[PDB]
Structure of Bestrophin-1:
Amino acid sequence: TITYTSQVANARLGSFSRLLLCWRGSIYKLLYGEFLIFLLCYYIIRFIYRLALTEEQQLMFEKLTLYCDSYIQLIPISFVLGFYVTLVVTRWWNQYENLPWPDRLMSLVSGFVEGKDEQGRLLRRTLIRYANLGNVLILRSVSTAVYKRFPSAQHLVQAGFMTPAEHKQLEKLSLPHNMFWVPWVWFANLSMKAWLGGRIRDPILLQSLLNEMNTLRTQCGHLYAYDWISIPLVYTQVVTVAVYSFFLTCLVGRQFLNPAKAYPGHELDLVVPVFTFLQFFFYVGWLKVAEQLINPFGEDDDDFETNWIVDRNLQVSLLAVDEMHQDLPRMEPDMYWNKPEPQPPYTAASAQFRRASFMGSTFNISLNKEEMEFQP
Amino acid sequence: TITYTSQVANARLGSFSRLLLCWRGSIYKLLYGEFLIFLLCYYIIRFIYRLALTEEQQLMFEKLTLYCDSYIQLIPISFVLGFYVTLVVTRWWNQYENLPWPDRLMSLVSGFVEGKDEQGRLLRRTLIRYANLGNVLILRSVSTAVYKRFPSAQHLVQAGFMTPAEHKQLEKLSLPHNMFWVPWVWFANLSMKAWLGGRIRDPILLQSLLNEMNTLRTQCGHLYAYDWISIPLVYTQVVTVAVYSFFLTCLVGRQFLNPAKAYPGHELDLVVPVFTFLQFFFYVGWLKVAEQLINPFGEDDDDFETNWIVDRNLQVSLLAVDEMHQDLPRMEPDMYWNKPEPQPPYTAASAQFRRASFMGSTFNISLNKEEMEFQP
Amino acid sequence: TITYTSQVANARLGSFSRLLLCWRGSIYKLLYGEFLIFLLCYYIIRFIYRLALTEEQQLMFEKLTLYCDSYIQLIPISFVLGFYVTLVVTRWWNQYENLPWPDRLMSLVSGFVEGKDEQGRLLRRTLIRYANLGNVLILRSVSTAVYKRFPSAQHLVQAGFMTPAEHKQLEKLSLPHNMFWVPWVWFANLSMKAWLGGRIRDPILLQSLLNEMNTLRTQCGHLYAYDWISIPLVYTQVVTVAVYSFFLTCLVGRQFLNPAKAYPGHELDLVVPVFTFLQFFFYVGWLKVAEQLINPFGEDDDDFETNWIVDRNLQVSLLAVDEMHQDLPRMEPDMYWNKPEPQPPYTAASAQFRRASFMGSTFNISLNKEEMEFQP
Amino acid sequence: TITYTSQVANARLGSFSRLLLCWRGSIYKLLYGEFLIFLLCYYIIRFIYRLALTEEQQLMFEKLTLYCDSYIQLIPISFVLGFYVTLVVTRWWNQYENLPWPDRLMSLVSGFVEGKDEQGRLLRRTLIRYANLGNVLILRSVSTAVYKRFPSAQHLVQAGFMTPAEHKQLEKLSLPHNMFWVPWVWFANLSMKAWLGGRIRDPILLQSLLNEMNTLRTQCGHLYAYDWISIPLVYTQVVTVAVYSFFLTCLVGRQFLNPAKAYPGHELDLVVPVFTFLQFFFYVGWLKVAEQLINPFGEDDDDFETNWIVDRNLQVSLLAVDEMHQDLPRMEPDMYWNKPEPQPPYTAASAQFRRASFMGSTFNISLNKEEMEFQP
Amino acid sequence: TITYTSQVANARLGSFSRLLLCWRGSIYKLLYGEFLIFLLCYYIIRFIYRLALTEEQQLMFEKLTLYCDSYIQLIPISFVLGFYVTLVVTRWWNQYENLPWPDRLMSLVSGFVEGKDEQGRLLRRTLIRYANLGNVLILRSVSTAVYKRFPSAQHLVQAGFMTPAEHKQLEKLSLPHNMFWVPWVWFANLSMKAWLGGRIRDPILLQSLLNEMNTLRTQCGHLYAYDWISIPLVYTQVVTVAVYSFFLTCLVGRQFLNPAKAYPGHELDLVVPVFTFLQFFFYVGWLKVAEQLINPFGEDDDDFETNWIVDRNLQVSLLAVDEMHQDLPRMEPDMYWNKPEPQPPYTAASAQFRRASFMGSTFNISLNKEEMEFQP
Ligand SMILES: [Ca+2]
Ligand SMILES: [Ca+2]
Ligand SMILES: [Ca+2]
Ligand SMILES: [Ca+2]
Ligand SMILES: [Ca+2]
């Protein structure tokens, strides 16, 4: 993930211009190799046409170039690219939205599962670790970085995500499918055991816990679904064929013919086709957007930081369920204890952001006196 | 379903180009027959125009040619294709999202329905089997592969999904409609019986179970709705008419008129119309995306693996409700029992994925001492 | 509703081509009259121009035709058609999604409302009949077919949906609004009475019942919303003007001018304008999609089968809440009672659909021995 | 709100044609003034060029018109109009969907809040009046018609929406913000008081009531948000500049040059530019769609009937919570008391709508005996 | 935020025209610097070409201008601008929808947390202050204005949002991540303590409180997500490259060549390129829409008033949970106590908005006498 929110906070002079100086996760870094190959092919064809052929062959090549230039269509490639990239971006944001965050569940666990003793600590930590284990299982199934971090369940055990007992239980329960669903059944059974043992005081609290755990399960299932059901290969191949056919016919139809022949559009020999290269940058970058976002769990610069998410989730959830359980700051009257209308101060740098309240669009409507009497 | 997520994990050199060497679910496999028919018709017309005409019918054909090519438009076909295919893809993903997964229900059943004895085993298995039976009923109603697997309720009984008693009950209840809704009423009545018999300890747990079952029912109803209410036949016919009219007028417009006659644009003879063939591939593949995704429950290469989903759901749900009920790994302190800030290790292949936490876009904003002072 | 899902299950040769032979809900049936009018007007103009005027008037008409030829724009009409039809299709699917289905409510009623005696039967049937009565009230308010079936509350009483007592209660409660909301108040009060009388054991069950009834009420309110708040008449008139201004200027600008005058685009006299007729079919069918779908509760071929939905809902709900209450098939161990991994069989026609499980996109990643070692 | 759903129920001959004869909420009524101004300016320019200008000035004006007619493009204005109008329509439908309907809350109040005496009547009426008061407060904040009806809280008190005691309490609570949120806190406190006093029998019923009231609060907050956060002024100005630049360029570029000079585009003088006028109608009406829908709470013909909604909500909610509380029609066996398959009759006008049930797309698949045999 | 809802309430004469006179948040203020730079560069090139070079160099520049003005395509830039700006607007409205509002939670707290004494006041205020503190933490993490107001946790303490005890607890809990999640765990633990101490009477009320808190947590997490996972830099760079390449090739291709050479489109020298400047305004303003909305928490005119939101939330929540707890207006019969059909009056200015109720689109369907008979 490349973040430039601070840079694009305000719509200043050249705000998007200053983003063109970035390298990581950029268009140049994405398509420099393709541009180099295109350059090599274009100039090889140019040299072949210029100083490798006879007069009749050059005339035939010029006829072919004139035939090719008219066959360069921008409406269809733009149309397919726009919708394909829109679909890819929508799926990418949905995939991020299905990343499981254990925050609600950990707050509920810390509140509900009672006991400041070792048994209560074990119960809370085991529940939140079941949640984290399910999350890391689906993440290592769907993300190459997480898989490289934990290439096996033995690696998961050595990293502390799984106990050896849990690993043995998983091996005993092994079926010819992905076993990421097992920790949710473990969580449900452990929560029922906690309620029966008196650690969870009410079945409504049990239901809230299981609802949050079910939401996490649904998010993980959506992640698995997005990993499994790819965008249709026919659609991807169609958009690729459009782009590459465009920039393969351009290789011939954008060649600088001899200016002596006084062609309508080939009166000048600029050597470099700057507009063809600009179109290459634009269209191939538009395609590279979809190329990068089609699997947002790879190792691209703009892919998600799944390893950081895993580490943060583990640390935060463990802290919340263990140290923060029934550990509150002292409850004391606040600064505005007897102030009916509190007014927090503004700094000198933020005094200009103090605004009057918006009371509605109809507030300033002016009505005459007679217009306001109720009619019988 | 054809998966290439691992192939497109990173935006590497020619990442989408390497996808053009596939055959399953590919554009070539989808439109090779149409391309062969187009080839045959095009070259039949070419041979008829040159070796089977006279010097006046030929001259007329040329007149028709330069008329047909001038009456070729791409914006309308691109528009109708883009919008229609976008609608088809949206409906395809919605249809996948409405595929019922019994994971939440099975976790709730395993947790809630108490009893490690034969009666408890039977109750849990029967509830989850009612869920699976409803899912398989709607799936065999809407999916050709599942129907070929289970062409009759007797086949369902022989497959173990339905008991002979359940089959007799369904036959007794037979209405002149699709009877896929019956297992949900069965589940509701059996869950009420379990609660009244003490197997379910609290009506809040009963409500949670029924909420999960009703979510499954809504998903199955949406699947039935998508099977029944097709995309408007008028819209499908409009897009088909656009594409086929384009590629029928191309048959005359894209003919290679003889070089001897004088015509702008037609000055040489390239035999093979490579640009017309590229356009055919692009547009007919764009249409084949919709042709394949319009019913994602057929037997195309990119259609859903409903049979595998059924088998996996049955196995996983039965295991979860029978063998995993109150069967937990031993609860022991984890690796980070007294570690305030756990830090799982990174492998050599993943050490580069260790990232600092993102604390917000405002973190690096610099303010002076006078700027930070609160104003009175 | 016209269904062709079975016909479009697989992407076969000419899959969308075989849909052009349909008559019901087809483009031909939708626009044959407008095509006939366009034909008649076009050939009236053609016959007037060639044999009705003098040479000067003919030359003036040729100049006007050339002027009109350059004012035939496809981009704007395509844009407005695409956006408007997309909106119409979205609203059409939303309207279908807001059609109330009593399945969840009927399962909850059958489970929760106890009593196999006459009073319990009456209570369950009355609750489900209140649901069905509200549904039929909103449906007869919004659908012409349902209104023609039940043109009056007396017709509803004769049909059995409403009792004479309920009819008199409605007449007593009569207000100058649509009274489709009354059955939900009746349902809430009757459910409260049932809970107070002991027929409903727990207020949590009461809450579940009322949540389902409120979901049905929201769906009915959305149906009323879509029936009341139409797509803006200005937008509909704009798209109609865009289509008709195109096909009114085509009448003059697509006339076959005399070939003797040797105009650029009028060398040939083909009599029948095939491209103009194809464009008429394409665009007028695109508009006919919106014309048919703008009110999906009319009597079009592709409109919803609301009468069938009403009949099916009544029958299914009554059966579920009366005959299926506490009436379950015999509970006995299944075929996989002691099978850890059930494997239901495949038929000969479905053996090709047996596939291995998808274990994740990262499953096949190959790592070296040194790469997999945890770093300190 | 202009309704034509009955007119567009079926896709008949000229179904959208017959909508062009409407005046209320129509394109003519929306843009007649703009069309008159554009007409006056166009003909002023034409007369000035024809008469006032000398020969050299006319020659310069002719060159200017020729240079202007090639700077009039439809693609960018079409894009900006389509996307902007789509966003405006989406926001308009969302704004209507956020209009609060008290139906679910009123059913819950009537059911849950017990007591047929004066105290129970007062409690139910006060709760539903708090809901209606919050709704009318946000509506008078966001809607010009509702503000004109109730220009002050004193007007609200005279209209009966607010009790003078409630007015005094609001004045005591007065804060420098919109106080539409106060009745929700009032409702919560009154519901808690009712539960503590025994009028509400169960805290789960209390929770259901508060959940419905909170849904209403969320809808009202969304209405306030839509009123406050307008569509970006930069975007609105961009679309306005596009349209107006188009039709200011057209003023000169569409002038009928003198036919004597014999430019190809201006060979004859039609006087009236019918195509420019049709384009004006199309584009300015497309913009008028967004102009009318940008604030759907104004006083346009297609704007919402917020006053009627307020009146209907008040009447219906008061009736439901006061006269309909525990007032049910007599519970008697229905027409299908012992009928397993109820078949309500059809009328002569609805006989053709009786259809067989759709049993699934796989129903008609034909399989051989050998194909249907299970394999080992 | 710039509001013009009252200005655009009605679709009057030139309603969008009158919005072109605004300055705050306007296209002029957004792109005047870019337009000045474009002006300077264009006229520098013009003055170079006019009198800086020799005749041969001027001829070469003229050929370059002719060959550059033929490579200006509005199609791709329009496509990418439309799609990218639509994505930006969608994300902007989602970011607004994820702004946390404590209204539902404060109503639930005021209702549920009992006690009119000092301890009850402290408990309610502390809970609502935990909610406000979490909101302000995420807002100061994501918003530059809020960060400038509160550049440190000590600033938060001095402002009254945090007590010294809470600051000391946060410092104890300090983790190398954003600590905005801590107040939710604090709220959960404090609510559980309140329920155990008898201040909250029922665990269902506890569950409702925690559900509202978790909804707020989800909103804050979505805000953090939008701050962190920005729009792909490759996509932003692609759209920027498209726009700037267009307006860089325009700098040369839109130059007024010598009229003496009688170029096809350079016959007249108007000095000022009005249409090029209009295109600059249109396209650069369309890009400035996305530039302003890409981070809606900056300090642009159309960016959100997060400081006002914070102040209003604090004041309103404190008032609701402290002063309005169990403080209700006197319950007395209303104006319509014995009126079955209340009819609130209309003012003179609003008497025209009294409309008859809409009874459904099928209301006016007229059927013959014999058409209404039920048939056997
Ligand atoms: Ca990637
Ligand atoms: Ca298919
Ligand atoms: Ca219809
Ligand atoms: Ca309006
Ligand atoms: Ca901004």
About this structure: The first strand of chain A starts at residue 374 and ends at 375.
